[model samples]
Target chain A: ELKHLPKYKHITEHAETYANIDAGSLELFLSLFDISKKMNHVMEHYFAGRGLSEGKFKILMLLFDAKDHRLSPTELAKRSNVTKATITGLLDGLARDGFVSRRHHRKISIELTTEGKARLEQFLPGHFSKISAVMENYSDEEKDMFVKMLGDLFERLSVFK
Target chain B: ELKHLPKYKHITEHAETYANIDAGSLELFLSLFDISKKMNHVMEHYFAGRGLSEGKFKILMLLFDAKDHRLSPTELAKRSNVTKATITGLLDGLARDGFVSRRHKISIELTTEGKARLEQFLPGHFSKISAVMENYSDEEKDMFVKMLGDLFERLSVFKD
Candidate 1:
């Protein structure tokens, strides 16, 4: 829900009165932070319009190819990074849409319906089209630079927690 | 909140069945999306532990620099991308902490108390910013910025 990021001049002028930071540091910080947030914001809206929450999308992917096309609710919840209760609501919603079904067995399992598999397959073209479009003209050098820079940024951010 | 970024192999194997995507597209998407989300999520935790909300912190920065150390609640709401009601709630919290006060026609201003308080306040904040970018050279940072700028502007692809 963070819709705004500060301009770099604001960071430089204001922050200088308070602490030690290089001018380039603030520039780097905002560009990286700004790009990511904008992308996340746009994609979230895009996904929601197509009724794809992150957890639900993950569930569809896992059931399709990550496993034997059948998964216990417990496994789905953990693997999808949602709580077990949240997974129930997700499963129930998909079931009503006729994209998933349940089985009673030694361990209860959820399976994508035949229509579910087709719909999941159909879902890809449009989404992937936009995804590849977003990054259409990037160079290998840019990609490698990102791999190191972004990977480093994520690692540093993770250490605080 | 996104705890996982999709692995390259996962995208390579599964995504190929469905659409035309180069291996690079997914990698770029995940890295950019993943880094930003992680930075945001981490800073949110850091700010919360320091008792700062985005609205609250933006107010501090605007008051400290963007304005003459004063701003109307309306300006705050629009600039902060928050509701006016949310701005009221935000102002009330800072007021309670004695960091800001209202001056009627001129609207709200940061207290001299709050000014010095944040002056003491931002080393912790600025240091984190520095630490994050310390590994990068100026040239490297600028090249990435140029690339990101081009990417962002072209994102008009998502037109209405």
Candidate 2:
């Protein structure tokens, strides 16, 4: 398939010596890699414009959607795919902005403050719209096919762990 | 479509308030994200076994595949998607390891060593990368790659 694409013709040619090398597949993997990097760049711009770091933005949204706008640091760590140690620094910054606060009655607990909820409310509509616009070209069927393939790939990749 | 997916039910629920949010679309986005992170982790492990950092490995490959196995720092920075300062540090490490050398007489041109270190690293690299895609059939791979190409084209539109 990549033989039809000019951008990767060189890569495909370079791959000829290697047996079982699927140049198209490698091209796809690298493109996804670049896509993720670009998304992070775009999201960073979005978060910075609202005076929020990515960590703060993610945590605030998680807490806002939770049962009571509260979760333990451990849960935050697991959900955000970051270590608890990293979560500590993020929470410190969020607390400084009055967007979040923590209590230590037993184990440390984190909760979104009233200001945090308001901040997320103010940000979510535009944020979601911007993100949605990125893939607006996909029809419903195309979207379903894309998601299905990703879910399948993720399941397969999990076996490598 | 996402109603049948277990991992995304919560995200689907969370998106209920946003009229424009498409659950399947969001699922694809997040899955692409998590997959990229996992791939980076796997690649880091692979590169570490070869005694190379990701940065050095990338630069070396670029040079190896180039017409003369040579490129400038500015070109390297642009292609590798890193800052020029970061490319300087990466080239420094590659130079230290005898994998690459710089010519000072002209502009900053990065040339691989005549010792053929790049050739030594080249043969097994493709096989190892090929192993990662072994799970998907050729047809499936083509389909997925086509989908990814479309997605990349969409993301590029936002740059303007």
Candidate 3:
């Protein structure tokens, strides 16, 4: 939280008589806060237990499915819909663990290590199954709707930054 | 965590090999984990200082914006992008706090209490400034991308 949020302070000072306009802005921000927190909560508890966090899994899985086994932080930033700092941390963790190697954007480029590929192969089955179980109750149409909605939200909210 | 997760038990048994795969998956998951965790951590530590969990704040804010000071739970859930079970819990917290009262789901409606607007309308500047101050720097932006990516994966991944 901001140590000195003047806007927040301004709002609260007169909270006893705050107008609906101020209340409206507060609501919009809070809604985003709730959604962000809840999504993070369930995903971390459910997906991170298998070793890799869910974000790390996406990179590995995407690379696994690609002809090559790598993506730049910039490319990854767009595809994964995350920021560079988070990827830096993820790559650092993967690199330290011997799963992926970085090449300074030269030569072989950013690539998964042999150990990385092996690790992914090892976990893919169980990971995939866990993912499957979550969607088991949804009909095919519902699954499509779920995917569509999530994608739409990410795309639409890109401007929120 | 799901108590009945088959993968959880499977990983527990084959811990060695799982560690190997975990390295790569770790690359993927940690980024997500950090963001997901930070989201809660910030909201709770930061947002809660203002006397509202992110969920509670959202509910109140929605009410603050209602055309008629009311909206169905279904409507709130749809707009808020939460599961019904989760939303139910949110409402429960609000009800306990005397911030919201619910009507049967003839339409999922919610009516705000007097204090509801008070808490939301307070506009704690520190919370707002703290949110952006903590979350909007270049480093934070990078982290946001990483976290968001993990979040996206969490949202999109399916069994094959």
Candidate 4:
């Protein structure tokens, strides 16, 4: 029965032996994995077209929403879920582009420059539209439910540690 | 309005200025993004406990499911959506672990370790995956899959 199916059919087809496999759940999980990959693939192109890397864009947005538009490099690393070392590399590139500047009044800190704010503002319109378009067919209620389900799944996954 | 909210508020808060921002959809997208990250984090733990990296395990499973339990490196890279260079590293590790072997005559091929380890691996994997996803009802699962399919279709338009 599994042999008749087309490509990427392994996830659904191979679970027949396991009484434990909830096909529905596994299917959804695989879909989530695939969708995330596709989202990143598209987003990389989208960001590159604007001459920005995704990491820098994320840092800029966080700084845009941050208090006083500044954060310590440690804080930036924490928020970005990257190492402080990696954040330094990303910050170096952003500084080269003049989108961010570092200050050291006491502890070293990073902040979006005036240029960064302008760039972020310019990018947000397209970014939001692109995301909105991906979600076009989902009704308001459907979207709400999707968010709720994801939140629930996120909470449940905390048990795996 | 944005300042009053709790943390993780970036999604809905920043979207308020845009007329095109479907708040619910944006929120869902953010949730999907967050959930994917969390899933990978936990899955890394799960796979590591089994003495396997996720990339190698993915190769193992794909090879296990392929015709005669064999696939070329190029096919593996294509199906995995990783580059050939990355696939080489993954295959190298799996080969070291004796979970897979590489055969080369005309072209490179990957074959799983004769179904013993493969059989040993599958039950636990499916069980853990099932446990992770048990929160949703069957109906909810179907709806989630439906929503994701719609999202995948929309995203396909931007494919290079």
In order of appearance, the predictions have TM-scores of 0.80, 0.75, 0.42, 0.73
Model 4 Cα lDDT, one tens digit per residue, B7-116: 24455756675447867777777667656656665667777887786677777778877887778888888776568899989888877777777776223334445367
The candidate with the higher lDDT, 1 or 2, is 1
lDDT of 1 by residue, B1-160 (tens): 5544534545555566646877666677767766666766776787788677655777887777745788887977776656888889999999898888988745888898888877777777778778877667878887877777766755545432
What fraction of correct interface contacts does each candidate retain? Answer: 0.54, 0.35, 0.06, 0.59
The residue-by-residue lDDT of candidate 1 on A36-120, one tens digit each, is: 6667677667668767776677788779864568999998887665789999998998888888898877789999899989987
In candidate 3, what are the lDDT values of residues B14-97, reduced to their tens digit? 433433333223322333233344445444665465556756665665665566657788777665555678888988877776
The best candidate in terms of lDDT: 1
Name the 10 consecutive residues with the lowest summed lDDT in model 2 chain B: B1-10
Chain A TM-score of each model, in the order shown? 0.78, 0.79, 0.58, 0.78
- Comparison by lDDT, 3 against 4, better one: 4
**Model 3 lDDT per residue over A1-161, tens place:** 11111122222233325433233233333333443554564556555556677678767765664457777777765556468888878878878877788876553345888888987777666664554333343344533333332333333222222
Best by TM-score: 1
Backbone clash numbers for all candidates listed? 0, 0, 33, 0
Instruction: List clashing residue pairs in candidate 2.
Output: none
Alpha-carbon lDDT, every model: 0.72, 0.67, 0.50, 0.71
**Candidate 2 residues A1-161, lDDT tens each?**
11112244445566775666767766765665555555555556656778877678779878987888889988998878678999989999898889999987658789888878886887777666655875677777776676766666555443333
Off by over 4 Å in 1: A1-6, A16-20, A72-79, A83-89, B1-6, B66-68, B71-98, B104-107, B151-160
Q: What is the C-alpha RMSD of each candidate to the true structure, in Å?
A: 3.8, 5.5, 15.0, 5.9
The residue-level lDDT of candidate 2 at B114 comes to 29
CAPRI band of model 2?
acceptable
Backbone clash pairs for candidate 1 read none
Query: What's the DockQ for every one of the candidates?
Result: 0.47, 0.33, 0.06, 0.39
